[PDB]
Amino acid sequence: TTLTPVICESAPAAAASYSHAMKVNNLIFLSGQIPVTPDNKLVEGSIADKAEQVIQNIKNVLEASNSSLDRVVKVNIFLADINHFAEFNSVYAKYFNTHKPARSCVAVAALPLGVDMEMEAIAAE
Amino acid sequence: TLTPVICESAPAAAASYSHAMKVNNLIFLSGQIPVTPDNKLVEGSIADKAEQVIQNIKNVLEASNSSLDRVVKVNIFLADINHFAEFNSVYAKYFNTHKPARSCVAVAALPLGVDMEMEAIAAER
Amino acid sequence: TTLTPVICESAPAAAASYSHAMKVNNLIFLSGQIPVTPDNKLVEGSIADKAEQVIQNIKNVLEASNSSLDRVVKVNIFLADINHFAEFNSVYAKYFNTHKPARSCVAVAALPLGVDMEMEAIAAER
Fold first, then answer.
1. Which overall architecture, per CATH, does domain A1-125 show?
2. Hey, is the C-beta of A3 within 8 angstroms of any chain C C-beta?
3. C60, C80, C79, C78: which is closest to C123 by C-alpha?
4. If we measure between CA atoms, which residue out of C54, C55, C67 comes closest to residue C21?
5. Nearest by CB to B73, which of C20, C22, C25?
6. Cross-link Glycyl lysine isopeptide (Lys-Gly) (interchain with G-Cter in ubiquitin): located at (chain B)?
C-alpha cells in the first residue's frame, strides 16, 4: 500500500494542514474545495459562478492526481443553504453528464470563510 | 474500470448521479432518503422513515452485487439530532451481527425537506 | 475481500451499532470519534482539550487497526460551531505536520451527546 500526497498550484492554498488529495494505491481522496480562486480570492457572483470555480478547482486537482472528471467515483456536496440545490445541480450536470459518479448532498450550518458550498470527491487514477 | 449501478427498485436520482459506483472491489452508494421507489415521500414516524431509507440502501446493494453484511462504512445525516436514539433502534435491526464503521451528524436541512439521508460504502461479493 | 471489524478497548464504547473501525483488505474506515474519554466521560474545557481527546481516540483506533497517524489517507471534520475552526486546526496541525491527509471540514447543526466536534478518517494498514 503506497500513499502519495498531491498538491497543485492551480487550486487554492490549503486553509489548514492538508494536501489537496491523497492517493492510496490507485484510489484518490480529494480534499473539500470551496468557491475560492487559485490565487485565494473569494468568488463573488451567482451560485453558478461559485460552483463553476469549485469544480474547476476539483478538475485541476484531479489532473495533478493523474485522474479526470470521468474517473470520479463518489462526490459529496455540502451546501450552506438547501435552496441553492437546483442552481448547484445545473453546473454539476454540465461536468457530470455521460459519467455520473455516486453522490450525496446535504445543507450544513456553515462552511469555512462563510462560503456557499464545499465539494469533496474520490476518484480512480 | 468504474462500473455505474442503476437500481430500478430505488427512488430516481434527484440530480446527475448513479445509485452507486463500483471501483475495483469497492462500492460507493449515493445518499438515500425516506422516499418510496414510486418517488413519494414517506409519512409517519422516524422509525418508518428509517425503514424506507435502509430498504433503499439494501436494494441498491443487491443491484451492486453486494449485501448489508458486506457494508464497510455508513454515514448518517439527521435533520434533527433528537431522532438519534429512535433511528439507531431501527438501524440495529439491519446491522447487529455485522457492524460497519459509522458516523452520524445532524445537519441543517436535507433535499426535499426529509428527516434523514444515509450513504454507504460496501465490498462487492 | 476480507472485512475485519476492529474493537478498540481504549476508545469510548460505540454509541450505536457500529465498530470502532472496519478493515476492507488494506483500507481502514474509522468511525466518527467525539471528545469523550475512554471512560465515557465528556471532556470539559477548551476546544483544544476536546480536539486533543478526539485525536487521541483516533490514534488509539488507528493503533488497534494496525495503522498509524502517518498512514491516514483522508479525514473528515464535523464542527458543531464553525467558529471553533482555528482552535481545532491548531491542535490538528500538531499530529498532521510532515504527513498531511486529504481533508474536509464543515459545521453542522448538532452532534451526538451534544459534543462540539466529530472526526472520522480512512487509513492504510501497515
1. 2-Layer Sandwich (3.30)
2. yes
3. C60
4. C67
5. C22
6. 49
